[PDB]
Design an enzyme around this catalytic site. Structure first.
Site, PDB file in Angstrom:
ATOM      1  CB  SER A 245      -1.012  -0.022   1.154  1.00 31.65           C
ATOM      2  OG  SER A 245      -0.541   0.565   2.349  1.00 31.65           O
TER       3      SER A 245
ATOM      4  CD  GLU B  97      -5.720  -4.389  -2.305  1.00 35.86           C
ATOM      5  OE1 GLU B  97      -5.591  -4.059  -1.106  1.00 35.86           O
ATOM      6  OE2 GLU B  97      -4.786  -4.878  -2.977  1.00 35.86           O
TER       7      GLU B  97
ATOM      8  CG  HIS C  21      -5.299  -2.646   2.141  1.00 33.77           C
ATOM      9  ND1 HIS C  21      -4.897  -2.456   0.836  1.00 33.77           N
ATOM     10  CD2 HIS C  21      -4.647  -1.711   2.875  1.00 33.77           C
ATOM     11  CE1 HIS C  21      -4.048  -1.444   0.780  1.00 33.77           C
ATOM     12  NE2 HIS C  21      -3.881  -0.974   2.004  1.00 33.77           N
TER      13      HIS C  21
END
Ligand SMILES: *[C@@H]1O[C@H](CO)[C@@H](O)[C@H](O)[C@H]1NC(C)=O
Ligand SMILES: *[C@@H]1O[C@H](CO)[C@@H](O)[C@H](O)[C@H]1NC(C)=O
Ligand SMILES: *[C@@H]1O[C@H](CO)[C@@H](O)[C@H](O)[C@H]1NC(C)=O
Ligand SMILES: *[C@@H]1O[C@H](CO)[C@@H](O)[C@H](O)[C@H]1NC(C)=O
Ligand SMILES: CC(=O)SCC[N+](C)(C)C
Ligand SMILES: CC(=O)SCC[N+](C)(C)C
Ligand SMILES: [Cl-]
Ligand SMILES: [Cl-]
Ligand SMILES: [Cl-]
Ligand SMILES: [Cl-]
Ligand SMILES: [Cl-]
Ligand SMILES: [Cl-]
Ligand SMILES: [Cl-]
Ligand SMILES: [Cl-]
Ligand SMILES: [Cl-]
Ligand SMILES: [Cl-]
Ligand SMILES: [Cl-]
Ligand SMILES: [Cl-]
Ligand SMILES: [Cl-]
Ligand SMILES: [Cl-]
EC number: 3.1.1.7
Lengths: 532, 532
Positions: free
Chosen positions: B197, B324, B437
């Site tokens: 990320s 996500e 995520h």
């Protein structure tokens, strides 16, 4: 004599016609208006002056002056829609098929032909009502009306060419039926009007127009709705096209009076030769002379009439065919041909989209393309072809109809919706065209019951089932046989939105016809185009 | 001594650590910059002054000052991401895991933690590199960098708080690795940076920034891309938020000098307590202090750099997880709860869409809604929930990444793309959240090889297969074992656009990842918003 009927307009003599190893009466070519010739061209229709003696109603009448499809000389698929009689401006007549022995007060059905308001004939073999009149025992009437400039040239404000006269022609025939059908054994209180495409849009227009509502009981609309994007234009657009038509004929354009006078001095074919030159855009499924939102025949905008419930409240039965757009893509979209599978390149797909949504800016075209493109296989010629086909049908017939059905149902007294998806086994058009625009008509008129026509037995069964739905609906306002054994065609409601498939398989019920795509055409795209 | 290494900054003493019934060396908490405290707060990082004697690198260092998730006290699912050490502004240190015996010149991998630029720690149990260093025999480094206002407050034009310092912290650690990793047996010429990320977006940012390109060989980006909508802001927006932060702390706002001085006098927690109050809109997946397009670290707009190929050209390996967005919907979208199935009403779906695309006008919101709504079953709570989940993931991670991969591949030297869709059997988060995520990280770091962690045998096999892909790629620029038996992960090309699924099943190859939805987010929606 069973073939002799005395009407308020005068006596008429019919003819006995054979049908399915039996016989019935036919009164062909009965006049309902004065010939709209000479200085009456473009003018409202005048009622036919009653006559002395007996009118010979043994043969079909002339067809109205119209463009003739010569795209495929000798091809039955296209020529079966062309005029099969002599063309003349003297074409305002109606036909009646009466059961034998003559009834006393039976259900009446009046057919209004389609043809994009630019063509059409009541005398086509596919419109022969003897089979339906005989099988369902109804009085079957088929009317006629001026098409092309002759019936829809519109110079709002003028009285020589106000517009919508072709629609007034229809109304006058309905008036005649209301006044004289009793003499033929018909019940003027149980008249059902029905038509396909332009005829279907027409039916809806009579439902809306106050001056037409009292002349019929219920209605059936096939592949056509009053709100279709091609079924009407504004008074300003109508005027622009009339002037542009005059410009094409080297007319004096200083005043309506001078324009109208010039056009009236031209021979019919002269107007037809340049009729297609007045369209505002390069496009498909768009016709030059159509009804005009005049404030008279139509009090206000179609949409405002629909929202407020300003329309005849009764029962209606309507539906669409699976591939409404194929015909118009063949005739004009690049890449389509009658003798090939017409697999479409990505480039041709793009060109087609533009021809299909002429009033669209680039963003709009992108929205449409994205909506109908499979991005995992965007070069698939068959998906591109079928995608374009859907675009044309959804935009021009299905979604407009779904919008109409949802608006009408809020105020109506009963709605029945169908989705016709059976391709006839003896179809001469190529396979890629699918279930073509107007090809449910032969089943509505019972042509499959004719052995020499070579339909399958299943197709004859379908035809009989459809004819009975239509006739039973016309008679009771419900397609279903009271206390019946067969499956029931459910009512269409605002909440459930149920409809049925009409094909050779056992009836199936569904919900929300083409809802995903129609939300796009009826809600999203319009917002987008208005915001941009 | 194997645990004693002499670097250009001074000598350091490591510690022997056990791993999978064996041992390796670990050098934890090595400083690479001077403590950014006092008047150095918000300033660029200064290199660590070399020290005399031996630095004790036997234990983890402090974590940087950051907001702490207390949304679910005692819940491992959320607390496993929180700081597990004491927080301090004195947090610029790095950790190294070295195989035993010490290598001479092996592959190096540098991990950059994620956490939306507002949180993150290099010391999390899930980031313990001993398993990866041991199994694949690589030198594994994990760095740290300032997050929150401390690392990204941006008052462009000023030298006391220029912005992007947190990114400069990363670069300095990379510089340190380039200069000293040889002494630990690492090959400074074969360094691979990788992160998830915000860490993945960071990797991409070093690929773009000229001042970072020479410090590494290749890169891996997990669930993050430099062009993500949340990964950066303009200089004007950065300035607005800095001022607004000061306004929240009753600061003098007459000049940058006075603003910066005031903020520097505040205790760390004082800045953190009001950090979330500066966001411009009510939204999800949006963080206050992130990198700024300053014209320095980033010469021009990210998009123009990508179009012109103004970036390091090498090989990259990247991918995304299936769900996500679930995490950010749980924490803020109305209707989502940790202990329920979170079935979403149509109303909540609408509210969610608005929170997900804050920069959208009504037309845009309608486009998104239509794009993700099944109109045949629009009240289906599960479809609404999953639909919103896709919206958040597609918009914030997948489509931005797909845009990056397609742009980079035109100039790059080799691309490998993956789609991770395996939900761990021991996941404590609810099922509706799917493949969350950041939950591929435990597999990248080999936690499944630890029996007491209770993963299935299949999950251990996957972890080993992923660790070998990553390590083999880092070493050769190709995840595939030369002359191997197992299935081959194909290169991603502009034309074929192939990728693979990463799960416990036998590898499968696909093409055009989320293409239909990404054409919407990357081409259509942007056009629409710009035209309106
Ligand atoms: C018109 O009616 C006459 C009878 O008067 C009939 O013989 C004829 O066939 C009908 N149509 C024509 C003119 O052929
Ligand atoms: C139609 O109208 C009648 C009253 O005129 C009413 O009783 C009936 O329920 C209505 N049916 C529908 C389908 O609206
Ligand atoms: C620091 O190094 C010393 C050896 O000098 C060691 O005993 C200690 O465990 C390390 N960490 C601390 C201070 O606990
Ligand atoms: C990578 O670059 C080398 C030359 O430096 C070239 O030979 C090779 O084909 C390239 N590979 C790819 C995937 O572009
Ligand atoms: C649907 C149609 O028949 S198209 C009209 C004929 N034209 C293409 C020559 C104008
Ligand atoms: C993704 C997140 O952790 S949300 C940040 C915390 N907040 C909702 C209290 C601002
Ligand atoms: Cl009498
Ligand atoms: Cl009379
Ligand atoms: Cl016959
Ligand atoms: Cl032109
Ligand atoms: Cl609809
Ligand atoms: Cl045919
Ligand atoms: Cl054929
Ligand atoms: Cl030395
Ligand atoms: Cl040295
Ligand atoms: Cl262990
Ligand atoms: Cl606010
Ligand atoms: Cl894409
Ligand atoms: Cl977990
Ligand atoms: Cl659970």
């Amino acid at each position: 004599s069973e073939l002799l009927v005395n009407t308020k307009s005068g006596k008429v003599m019919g003819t006995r016609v054979p049908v399915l190893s039996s016989h019935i009466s036919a009164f062909l070519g009965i006049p309902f208006a004065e010939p709209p010739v000479g200085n009456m061209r473009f003018r409202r229709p005048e009622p036919k002056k009653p006559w002395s003696g007996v009118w010979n109603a043994s043969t079909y009448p002339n067809n109205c002056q119209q463009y003739v499809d010569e795209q495929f000389p000798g091809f039955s698929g296209s020529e079966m829609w062309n005029p099969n009689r002599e063309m003349s401006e003297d074409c305002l007549y109606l036909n009646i098929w009466v059961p034998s022995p003559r009834p006393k007060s039976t259900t009446v059905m009046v057919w209004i032909y389609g043809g994009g308001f630019y063509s059409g004939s009541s005398t086509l073999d596919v419109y022969n009502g003897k089979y339906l009149a005989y099988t369902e025992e109804v009085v079957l009437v088929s009317l006629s009306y001026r098409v092309g400039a002759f019936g829809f040239l519109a110079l709002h404000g003028s009285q020589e060419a106000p517009g919508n006269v072709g629609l007034l022609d229809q109304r006058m025939a309905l008036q005649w039926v209301h006044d004289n059908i009793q003499f033929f054994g018909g019940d003027p209180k149980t008249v059902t009007i029905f038509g396909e495409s332009a005829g279907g849009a027409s039916v809806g227009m009579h439902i809306l127009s106050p001056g037409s509502r009292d002349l019929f009981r219920r209605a059936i609309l096939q592949s056509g709705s009053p709100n279709c994007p091609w079924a009407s234009v504004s008074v300003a657009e109508g005027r622009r096209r009339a002037v542009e038509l005059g410009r094409n004929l080297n007319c004096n354009l200083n005043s309506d009076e001078e324009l109208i006078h010039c056009l009236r001095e031209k021979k019919p074919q002269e107007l037809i030769d340049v009729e297609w030159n007045v369209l505002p855009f390069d496009s498909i499924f768009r016709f030059s002379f159509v009804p005009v939102i005049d404030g008279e025949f139509f009090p206000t905008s179609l949409e405002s009439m629909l929202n407020s419930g300003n329309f005849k409240k009764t029962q209606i039965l309507l539906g669409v065919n699976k591939d409404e757009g194929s015909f118009f893509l063949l005739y004009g979209a690049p890449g389509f041909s009658k003798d090939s599978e017409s697999k479409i390149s990505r480039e041709d797909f793009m060109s087609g989209v533009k021809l299909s949504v002429p009033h669209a800016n680039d963003l709009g075209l992108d929205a449409v393309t994205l909506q109908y493109t499979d991005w995992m296989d965007d070069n698939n010629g068959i998906k591109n072809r079928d995608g374009l086909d859907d675009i044309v049908g959804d935009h021009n017939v299905i979604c407009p109809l779904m919008h109409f059905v949802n608006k009408y149902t809020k105020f109506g007294n009963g709605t029945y919706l169908y989705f016709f998806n059976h391709r006839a086994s003896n179809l001469v058009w190529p396979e890629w065209m699918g279930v073509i625009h107007g090809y449910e008509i032969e089943f509505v008129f019972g042509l499959p019951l004719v052995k020499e026509l070579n339909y399958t037995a299943e197709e004859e069964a379908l035809s009989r089932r459809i004819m009975h739905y239509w006739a039973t609906f016309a008679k009771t306002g419900n397609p279903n046989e009271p206390h019946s054994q067969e499956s029931k065609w459910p009512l269409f409601t605002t909440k459930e939105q149920k409809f049925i498939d009409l094909n050779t398989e056992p009836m199936k019920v569904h919900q929300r016809l083409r809802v995903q795509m129609c939300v796009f055409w009826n809600q999203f795209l319009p917002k987008l185009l208005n915001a941009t």
